[PDB]
Amino acid sequence: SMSYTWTGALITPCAAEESKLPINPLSNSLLRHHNMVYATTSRSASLRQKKVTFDRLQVLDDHYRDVLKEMKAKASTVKAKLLSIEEACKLTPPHSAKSKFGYGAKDVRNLSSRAVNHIRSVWEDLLEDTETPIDTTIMAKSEVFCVQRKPARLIVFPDLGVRVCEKMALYDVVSTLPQAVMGSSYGFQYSPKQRVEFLVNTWKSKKCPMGFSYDTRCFDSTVTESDIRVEESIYQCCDLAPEARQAIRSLTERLYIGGPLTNSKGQNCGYRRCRASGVLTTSCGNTLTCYLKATAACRAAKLQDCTMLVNGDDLVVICESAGTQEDAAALRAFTEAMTRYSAPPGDPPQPEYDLELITSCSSNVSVAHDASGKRVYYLTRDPTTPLARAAWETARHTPINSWLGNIIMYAPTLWARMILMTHFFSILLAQEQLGKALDCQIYGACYSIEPLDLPQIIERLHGLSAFTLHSYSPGEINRVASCLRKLGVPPLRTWRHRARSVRAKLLSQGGRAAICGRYLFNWAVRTKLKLTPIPLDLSGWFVAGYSGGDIYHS
Ligand SMILES: CCCCN(C)C(=O)c1c(F)cccc1OCC(=O)N[C@H](CO)Cc1ccccc1
């Protein structure tokens, strides 16, 4: 069937859209070539609609059915909890889209009567009505990139009231089931240093390893009604409260498998028969679907000892080599199988025989050395997009931000350390906001974090070596260097000069600021200070990992 059908009504914005990087002193100190940085808008939405709209031809086979039953046998060990309205409300992001029913995310969080009464009514409706399609809004998402232009991504989400009900029925499921089903291959359970450990150990565990990332084109659109019902069949193997079982069955038929699209102006926009980007089960569902399809395709292709690492639609496979011609051919057979499964490639996959050449989760493993000269593996990526976004959020007030999560994810990197930390710490210090908690977007989720806690966070997510790395690899330095010339970012000597200046200010204030000076900026001085383990709340991160978007943790 068609992933989408359209009536001709437009994908509308509900406010003016900015597509150019403003000319502003603070962002200009970071990046000079402002004309290279752009934000997507609803003006490119029709181009995206064309790409995401197509017919899906799915053909399932014995390997798929075998793998599906192996997954269900493991899902069968799961016992899941129904969340109370209060628990689901506290998981609601503060700046989450308001309901069209007279209340907003803050009213939800405060347990206001209007909000709670309405959420309760929505829940009872899920229990009563198993068929009426649930309305969704379609919007063009505003995302920032560097030229060489991407059309806007389209986001699909239901009303606030429904989102809170999804958490009630399925939060515990999305947070515990993927690990029970996929074990070590479930990527979202890992901190960055633990993802590196698994990739390095899996690689080292093969006699002759071969690995590849697999890019599925427009994954959400490739997701069929069958996939979504199969996904539900895995959820139904959990021990569930009667009302959760019903709310899952109703959400699946009324929301998950598809439904009507309304634009911001309230106009009937079209119809969806594929994955909605903005529902609770998107991340877990995509992960389970991508894992099932890949696991079965490996058997079909006869790849050997194929270890998966799956994070939503992001896939990396590491296996035993059968020789070079054999590998090329088996990988083409793997692609042919995924294609029948309705998971066709975007960029053709290629076999790799070096772990550092594989890009997965938009990152690659690289190597540096700690103060004692020992090798430390860590994740990095091309810094273009992170720098373009840091510049945009510097010039444009963003009640939400992406730069802080970037520093946390990429802390051991040369670029996050010399540029990002230096830049944002200089500014927050001048503005007396080092201590101000920020609402940090990490993938689709939300975390409240004070910049002053960065050292403790980094030491846990990456180890104390993140503050001592040096001797980065030539390829990494090469890549960083070329991006700075391309974006007009001042050279590293200038960032060193800035860091020394902010480091001295951080030290002079003492307290938590001085801890930031000592750990975050020790790379910038000779007279290194003693780096000992720093004398919290990492549970919301560690117990379930990243369980999906529109989730808030404090
Ligand atoms: C819990 C969500 C926020 C806490 N962060 C930031 C995490 O990492 C994280 C964590 F600390 C504990 C548990 C799970 C976590 O994350 C899930 C996940 O898939 N993370 C990956 C790394 O494995 C992010 C990443 C991908 C590529 C390159 C660099 C970093």
Side-chain angles (χ1 to χ4, degrees):
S1 71
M2 295 304 303
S3 43
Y4 296 93
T5 70
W6 302 104
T7 61
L10 299 175
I11 289 159
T12 53
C14 40
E17 307 173 292
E18 253 207 297
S19 65
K20 299 184 135 313
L21 181 67
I23 309 181
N24 168 294
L26 301 173
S27 59
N28 188 69
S29 287
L30 161 69
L31 186 150
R32 277 58 184 295
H33 301 155
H34 57 82
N35 281 331
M36 285 182 86
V37 176
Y38 71 91
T40 55
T41 74
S42 67
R43 303 184 299 263
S44 58
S46 58
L47 291 181
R48 177 65 57 175
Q49 295 165 263
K50 182 172 166 190
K51 312 205 241 236
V52 307
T53 304
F54 54 82
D55 187 38
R56 277 87 39 86
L57 267 90
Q58 190 169 44
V59 178
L60 318 171
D61 59 10
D62 285 353
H63 287 309
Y64 176 98
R65 292 190 280 270
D66 287 358
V67 176
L68 172 55
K69 293 179 222 175
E70 291 164 27
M71 292 170 73
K72 296 181 70 174
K74 289 180 189 116
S76 275
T77 68
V78 180
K79 174 163 185 164
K81 297 177 195 219
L82 188 56
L83 252 51
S84 60
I85 299 185
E86 259 201 43
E87 309 174 292
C89 286
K90 308 175 179 191
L91 286 159
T92 294
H95 299 112
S96 177
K98 69 181 180 285
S99 169
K100 77 195 32 168
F101 304 102
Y103 63 91
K106 301 210 193 170
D107 301 320
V108 158
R109 293 191 64 68
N110 284 337
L111 306 188
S112 106
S113 71
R114 173 101 138 220
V116 167
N117 293 351
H118 184 253
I119 284 149
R120 174 185 236 184
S121 93
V122 172
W123 176 259
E124 299 291 341
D125 176 87
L126 286 175
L127 304 181
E128 289 161 7
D129 181 341
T130 64
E131 164 199 333
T132 311
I134 287 167
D135 192 42
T136 63
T137 301
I138 177 159
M139 289 303 280
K141 186 188 165 174
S142 167
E143 289 186 298
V144 168
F145 303 97
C146 174
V147 298
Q148 306 215 260
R149 292 230 186 160
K150 294 175 180 289
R153 268 190 256 272
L154 310 170
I155 59 173
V156 182
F157 55 96
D159 188 81
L160 180 51
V162 174
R163 302 198 310 269
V164 172
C165 291
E166 297 182 69
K167 280 160 179 84
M168 287 184 276
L170 279 148
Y171 179 75
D172 195 46
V173 168
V174 308
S175 293
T176 59
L177 178 139
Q179 214 182 343
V181 171
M182 298 169 288
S184 67
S185 304
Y186 179 50
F188 285 134
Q189 73 188 279
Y190 298 129
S191 67
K193 87 182 181 197
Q194 293 166 343
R195 179 187 177 84
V196 168
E197 196 184 10
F198 185 70
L199 285 166
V200 174
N201 286 339
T202 299
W203 188 262
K204 308 216 228 197
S205 80
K206 320 279 167 184
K207 194 190 191 294
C208 187
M210 181 277 285
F212 63 91
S213 48
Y214 186 86
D215 171 47
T216 300
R217 39 160 313 107
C218 305
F219 190 102
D220 283 1
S221 287
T222 75
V223 173
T224 69
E225 307 104 316
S226 174
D227 283 342
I228 291 164
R229 241 103 70 160
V230 157
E231 174 185 338
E232 186 212 355
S233 88
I234 292 170
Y235 301 152
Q236 297 283 356
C237 292
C238 296
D239 174 281
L240 291 157
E243 295 194 347
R245 218 179 261 290
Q246 186 55 69
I248 294 170
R249 177 90 280 280
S250 293
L251 284 168
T252 294
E253 292 305 319
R254 301 178 59 196
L255 183 57
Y256 305 151
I257 61 170
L261 308 157
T262 306
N263 63 23
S264 70
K265 300 185 122 168
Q267 313 168 312
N268 180 37
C269 210
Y271 204 83
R272 163 189 60 93
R273 303 185 169 267
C274 66
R275 178 83 68 209
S277 85
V279 293
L280 186 63
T281 52
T282 302
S283 178
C284 174
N286 279 345
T287 308
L288 291 165
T289 297
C290 181
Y291 173 102
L292 170 48
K293 291 188 186 172
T295 300
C298 159
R299 301 183 177 187
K302 303 194 153 347
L303 283 170
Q304 288 139 39
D305 191 24
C306 55
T307 307
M308 308 302 167
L309 186 55
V310 197
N311 290 58
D313 64 352
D314 204 286
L315 177 64
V316 65
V317 184
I318 292 174
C319 39
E320 205 57 78
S321 181
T324 295
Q325 295 294 299
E326 291 82 8
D327 287 349
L331 176 52
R332 280 184 305 259
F334 173 87
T335 300
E336 297 182 310
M338 292 294 279
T339 304
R340 293 188 283 275
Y341 291 157
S342 188
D347 345 281
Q350 287 310 132
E352 302 290 354
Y353 301 86
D354 181 1
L355 176 54
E356 307 184 24
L357 295 175
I358 299 165
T359 292
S360 84
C361 271
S362 309
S363 324
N364 65 286
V365 171
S366 195
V367 181
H369 303 80
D370 70 24
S372 72
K374 103 201 224 199
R375 296 171 169 167
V376 171
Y377 291 101
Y378 67 98
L379 295 167
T380 186
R381 57 163 298 152
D382 189 281
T384 299
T385 300
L387 301 185
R389 303 194 171 157
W392 188 289
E393 304 163 5
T394 293
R396 273 305 170 243
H397 194 243
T398 51
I400 293 146
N401 82 69
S402 88
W403 66 264
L404 189 48
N406 260 322
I407 284 166
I408 293 164
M409 285 173 67
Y410 295 102
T413 80
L414 167 65
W415 55 278
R417 303 172 71 205
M418 305 176 60
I419 299 159
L420 294 173
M421 290 186 187
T422 305
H423 179 68
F424 289 108
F425 270 80
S426 289
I427 295 165
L428 291 155
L429 188 138
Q431 298 180 0
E432 269 283 316
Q433 300 175 333
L434 290 160
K436 173 145 168 232
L438 293 185
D439 276 338
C440 319
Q441 169 87 344
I442 289 200
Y443 296 144
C446 183
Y447 315 77
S448 192
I449 310 176
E450 299 188 8
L452 281 174
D453 291 329
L454 263 171
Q456 300 97 282
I457 289 171
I458 288 168
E459 164 164 10
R460 292 273 315 272
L461 263 60
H462 304 282
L464 261 178
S465 71
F467 309 117
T468 77
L469 292 197
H470 61 112
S471 307
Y472 285 90
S473 72
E476 177 64 4
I477 291 159
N478 280 6
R479 185 164 69 189
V480 168
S482 145
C483 164
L484 310 203
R485 298 184 297 256
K486 163 185 82 189
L487 289 170
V489 171
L492 300 175
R493 58 180 181 77
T494 297
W495 291 104
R496 204 219 167 194
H497 296 338
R498 306 190 173 161
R500 286 160 69 75
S501 167
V502 79
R503 179 183 177 271
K505 293 176 187 107
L506 290 162
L507 293 181
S508 85
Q509 313 186 335
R512 294 193 303 158
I515 294 170
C516 283
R518 176 191 287 251
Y519 292 73
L520 310 188
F521 304 99
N522 214 39
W523 58 264
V525 302
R526 302 217 49 207
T527 312
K528 333 228 117 256
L529 299 184
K530 294 226 164 166
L531 254 40
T532 79
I534 300 162
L536 244 172
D537 274 13
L538 302 213
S539 173
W541 274 358
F542 291 87
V543 328
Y546 173 75
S547 54
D550 195 28
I551 295 289
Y552 179 73
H553 294 296
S554 60

